[PDB]
Design a protein around this ligand. Structure first.
Ligand SMILES: c1cc2cnc3ccsc3c2cn1
Length: 252
């Protein structure tokens, strides 16, 4: 199969993702590899169109500010569709962590640093993603990159949801969600993964008398990061600038 984006032809190699949007692995005329995100605007309302346009403008602006944000090379927006030419990753973080038995402490730290940089950048532009999960990150050349910003309208998981989001959102909400991802990378499960029932799980996340277990590991700095991120009171939670100065990210 084939497709045109701003007068340039792309040969389709395979389908990567998919609701009213499909993501494909493609090749250009110069035989280079990209990802084309196709979005169908056929049954999209004005609020939806506006959320999609807002996300595209933020992605395109924030390109320049950090290499930990996915590259957007070009796009074609009409009334019926959106075509976005982006860089191709190797795998998303969720699929990678699910396949992998154990994570090496060096790659985890490297990945954590990238997650902090990408999220820091969005916060500096007034954006709180509000729905961070490992699916929002992409491995590209041993480098973790953020794929989206949470503006445009793993499906609806609550394992990474901060207590304040369950009650109701400041940058501290993204800190909780990032801590849950690092907790998965550390202990092999999210802090409340063991609770099947969604109601009982939402009740545990908000419950202060419900103690999050932090089993002893050889990395005390890593244990401290986790305890700092996973503080139920947003006022008592560590900030991104504070996490970037933490020993876990700096020592050695
Ligand atoms: C947008 C762009 C992507 C680029 N590359 C990859 C590679 C695996 S998922 C994915 C993407 C998913 N959404």
């Amino acid at each position: 199969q084939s497709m045109s984006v701003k007068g340039r032809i792309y040969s389709i190699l395979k389908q990567i993702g998919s609701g009213s949007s499909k993501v494909f692995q493609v090749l250009n005329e110069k035989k280079q590899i990209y990802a084309i995100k196709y979005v169908n605007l056929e049954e999209a309302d004005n609020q939806t169109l506006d959320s999609y346009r807002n996300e595209i403008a933020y992605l395109n602006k924030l390109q320049q500010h950090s290499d930990k944000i996915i590259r957007l090379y070009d796009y074609e927006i009409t009334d019926q569709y959106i075509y976005m030419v982006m860089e191709c990753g190797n795998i998303d973080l969720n699929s990678w962590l699910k396949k992998k038995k154990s994570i090496d402490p060096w790659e985890r730290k490297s990945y954590w640093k990238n997650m902090l940089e990408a999220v820091h950048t969005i916060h500096q532009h007034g954006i709180v993603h509000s729905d961070l999960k490992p699916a929002n990150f992409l491995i590209v050349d041993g480098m973790l990159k953020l794929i989206d910003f949470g503006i445009a309208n793993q499906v609806g998981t609550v394992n990474y949801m901060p207590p304040e989001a369950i009650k109701d959102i400041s940058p501290k909400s993204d800190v909780w969600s990032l801590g849950c991802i690092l907790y998965y990378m550390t202990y092999g499960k999210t802090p409340f993964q063991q609770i099947i029932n969604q109601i009982s799980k939402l009740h545990a996340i908000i419950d202060p008398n419900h103690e999050i277990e932090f089993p002893d590991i050889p990395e005390k700095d890593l244990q401290d990061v986790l305890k700092c991120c996973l503080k139920r009171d947003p006022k008592q939670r560590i900030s991104i600038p504070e996490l970037l100065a933490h020993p876990y990210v700096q020592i050695q």
